[PDB]
Design a binder for this molecule. Structure first.
Ligand code: HEM
Ligand code: HEM
Ligand code: HEM
Ligand code: HEM
Ligand code: CA
Ligand code: CA
Lengths: 324, 313
C-alpha cells in the first residue's frame, strides 16, 4: 500500500549523485578529460575506425542498436553490447560462460577490446607520438617516470566511464520518497516485479548486474509460423547440466537499450518480459501482467549524461597509420 | 611588414563570428538541435551502423583519418573525406570528375549519402516512427502540414553544419590586426604562399574550396601533379583552413606529411619551384590556419519504437 514504497526501498537504491571511487584509480578533472578523449579516439583500434563510442553510444543509451557485435577478447561469439551507462556499478562483467572460468577470469574491458582490435605496443607508440597526450598522462598520473602505459590508458578511460551514470529516473525519485514519481500502471508493474520475484535476479542498486544464473534464452526449433521477434519463438533453457551460466543484466534504462538478451533476438520490451515469465523459474505471466511490468521498467530510464565531445589532438609524423 | 599585412587583408577574409544564413533554410535553436541529432543518428543508414560523424568526426578535425572512404552516391570510387568544418563556405562540392559531368551532377551531401546507404522511403518511415522526431520537425518546419520529408531532414542537418565553423585561427587574428599573431617562420611562409602564387587557387574566406582546376596528384617524392586538361577532367582546390589537422592529403589521401603536400604543390605544372626550406616555411604558415574547434554537446537521440524498421541484414 506503501508497504510497497518501503519494500522497494529495502531491495533497491538510487543512482548516487557522484561518480563512485575506483580502487587504485583516483578521479580528477584531468583524468576524466583524458579518459573522455581516449574513449572517443578511434586511434586505439589498428584500422583507425572503431572507438568505444562505436558500440557504446552515449546518445543512444550507451549501446549500439544491433543484435550482436564482437568487441572484447573473452566473448563466446557475437553478443549484444551492454550499455556503458551505470556500467561502473555492475560486478558480472561477462555475458556468459562456464561458471568455473567466470570466477577466475581477469577483469579489464578496455584491455580485452584493444588487444582484440590492435596491439598495445602500437597504441602506446600512438600516445607517445602526440605531445598533448603525453602532457595529459603526466598530469593524470603524477608520480610516474613514464605514465604512458597501456594500463594507465585503461585507468583514464574507466574514470571517464564512472561519470557515465543516469541519476533521477522516475523510479529513483520514488525510492527517494516521492510516491507520485510512479504512475498507477508503473506502480502496479512494480508490484508484480516484486511478487513475481524478478527482483531476485534483477535487484539492487542496478536492478541486476551482479549475478550469474544457469538460464539462457534460446530460439525454439520447429515452425516458421510467427512474426520475427515474437515470444512464441524464444524460451528460457536451463544450463545447470553443463555448469554453464549467464549474467542477469542490469535493467536500468532497459527501455532504450533494445534489442534484448545476450543474442539481441527480442526487440519488444513487453516481449522480453513475456519470455522471462518462464516456468524454468516458476513464473507465470498473463498478457496484462507482462504489460504492467514493462510499464514499471519504463520508469528505469534516468537522466542521460551531457557529454561535450572531446577535441582530440592531431597525429604527428611519428604516429602509426591505419593498418593495411 | 605593413605591406604584407595589407596584401593579406586584400586576398583573404577571416571566419565570421557566426553561422552564415542559408537561403530558404533559416536557423533556429530547434532546427539546429534537430540537425545535430540527425547528423549523429546512425539510423539514417540501413544497417544503423553509420552516421555523418563516423567519417566527418567533429573531435578529429571533421574528417576521418583514412586515405579513402565511400559516403556519397556521386562518388565513382573511394575518396578522401573532406572536413565538415567550414564546409558551409565552400562552392566546389565534389572532389573530381569530368568538368561536363560535374556541371550536371545533382548536389546535396546529405541526400547523396542517405540515398547510397538507404532509401528515402525507409529513412522517412524511420523518422515517422519516433514521436520525438515528428514533434521536432513540426517545430522546426511549422510552414508544412507534413514536415517529415527527405528535403527537410537535409535542411536541418545543413543548419547544424553551418555552426561547425572555426573562428580565431592565428592567421584570422593577424587579418584582424595583430601582426604578432603570426611568428617569424609563419610570416615568412605567408610571404612565400603569396609570392609563389598558392593564393591563386587557395584564396578568399576559406583559402580555396571555390574552384575546379585541370591538375591532380597521382603516383610519379613519390607523388606528383599531373595536367588533366586533355581529358576535360578537373579537381577541386580544397580550402586549406585546418589543413594541419585533416591529413592525409589530396583526393586519394596519398600523402600524410603536410610539408610533403606543400612540396608536391610546388609543381612545374603551375610554374612554382620550392626549395626544401621554402616548403617548410609555407607548411609553418598553413599551421596558422587551425581555428577553434567547435564545442559540440553529443546529442541525446530518441529511442526507436515497435514501428521503427530494424537494421538491414
Ligand atoms: C575500449 C573501448 C570499449 C570500452 C571502454 C567498452 C566497454 C565495455 C564494458 C564496460 C563492458 C562490460 C559492461 C558491464 O560490465 O556491465 C563491455 C562489454 C561488451 N562490449 Fe565493449 N567496450 C569497448 C569497445 C567495444 C567495441 C568497439 C565493441 C563492438 C565492436 C564492444 C562491444 C561489447 C560487447 C559485445 C560486450 C559484451 C561482451 C560479452 O560479455 O560477451 N565494445 N564493453
Ligand atoms: C518476471 C520477472 C522478470 C523480468 C521482467 C525480467 C526481465 C529481464 C529482461 C528485460 C532481460 C533482458 C535484459 C537485457 O537484455 O538487457 C532479462 C534477462 C535475463 N534475466 Fe530476467 N527478468 C525476470 C526474472 C528473472 C529471474 C527470476 C532470473 C533468474 C533466475 C532472471 C535472469 C535473467 C537472465 C540470466 C537474463 C539473460 C538471459 C540471456 O541474455 O540469454 N530474470 N530479464
Ligand atoms: C549524412 C551524413 C553526412 C554528411 C552531412 C556529410 C557531409 C559532407 C559534405 C558537406 C561533403 C562536401 C564538403 C564540401 O563540399 O566542402 C562531403 C563529402 C564527402 N564525404 Fe560526407 N557526409 C555525410 C556522411 C558521410 C559518410 C558516412 C562518409 C563515409 C563513409 C562520408 C565520406 C565522404 C567523402 C569520401 C566525401 C568526398 C566525396 C567526393 O566528392 O568524392 N560522408 N560530406
Ligand atoms: C605553393 C603554392 C601551393 C600550396 C602551398 C598548396 C597547398 C595545397 C595543399 C596543402 C593541398 C592538399 C589539401 C587537402 O588535401 O586538404 C592542395 C591540393 C590541391 N591544390 Fe594546391 N597549393 C599550392 C598551389 C596550387 C595552385 C597554383 C593550384 C591551382 C592552379 C592548386 C590547386 C590544388 C588542387 C587542384 C588540389 C587537389 C589535387 C588532388 O587532390 O589530387 N594548388 N594544395
Ligand atoms: Ca540490449
Ligand atoms: Ca584530408
Amino acid at each position: 500500500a506503501d508497504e510497497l514504497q518501503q519494500r522497494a526501498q529495502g531491495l533497491f537504491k538510487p543512482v548516487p549523485a557522484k561518480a563512485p571511487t575506483l580502487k587504485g584509480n583516483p578521479a580528477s578533472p584531468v583524468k576524466v578529460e583524458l579518459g573522455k578523449m581516449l574513449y572517443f579516439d578511434p586511434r586505439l583500434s589498428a584500422s583507425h575506425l572503431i572507438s568505444c563510442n562505436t558500440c557504446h553510444n552515449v546518445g543512444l543509451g550507451g549501446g549500439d542498436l544491433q543484435a550482436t557485435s564482437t568487441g572484447h577478447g573473452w566473448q563466446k561469439g557475437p553478443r549484444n553490447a551492454p550499455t556503458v551507462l551505470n556500467s561502473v556499478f555492475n560486478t558480472a562483467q561477462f555475458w556468459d560462460g562456464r561458471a568455473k572460468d567466470l570466477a577466475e577470469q581477469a577483469k579489464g574491458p578496455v584491455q580485452a577490446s584493444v588487444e582484440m582490435n590492435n596491439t598495445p605496443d602500437q597504441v602506446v607508440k600512438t600516445l607517445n607520438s602526440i605531445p598533448d597526450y603525453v602532457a595529459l598522462f603526466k598530469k593524470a598520473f603524477p608520480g610516474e617516470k613514464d605514465p604512458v602505459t597501456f594500463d594507465n590508458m585503461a585507468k583514464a578511460i574507466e574514470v571517464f566511464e564512472a561519470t557515465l551514470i543516469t541519476p533521477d529516473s522516475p523510479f529513483d525519485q520514488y525510492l527517494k520518497g516521492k510516491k507520485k514519481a510512479l504512475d498507477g500502471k508503473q506502480t502496479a508493474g512494480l508490484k508484480l516485479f516484486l511478487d513475481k520475484g524478478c527482483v531476485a535476479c534483477h535487484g539492487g542498486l542496478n536492478l541486476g548486474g551482479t549475478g550469474y544464473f544457469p538460464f539462457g534464452v534460446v530460439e525454439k526449433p520447429a515452425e516458421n509460423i510467427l512474426p520475427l521477434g515474437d515470444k512464441g519463438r524464444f524460451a528460457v533453457t536451463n544450463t545447470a547440466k553443463d555448469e554453464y551460466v549467464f549474467r542477469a543484466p542490469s535493467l536500468r534504462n532497459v527501455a532504450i537499450t533494445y534489442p534484448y538478451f545476450h543474442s539481441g533476438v527480442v526487440w519488444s520490451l513487453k516481449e522480453a518480459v513475456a519470455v522471462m515469465g518462464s516456468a524454468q523459474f516458476g513464473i507465470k505471466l498473463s498478457d496484462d501482467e507482462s504489460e504492467a511490468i514493462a510499464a514499471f521498467l519504463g520508469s528505469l530510464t534516468g537522466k542521460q549524461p551531457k557529454v561535450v565531445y572531446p577535441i582530440m589532438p592531431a597525429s604527428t609524423d611519428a604516429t602509426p597509420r591505419p593498418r593495411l
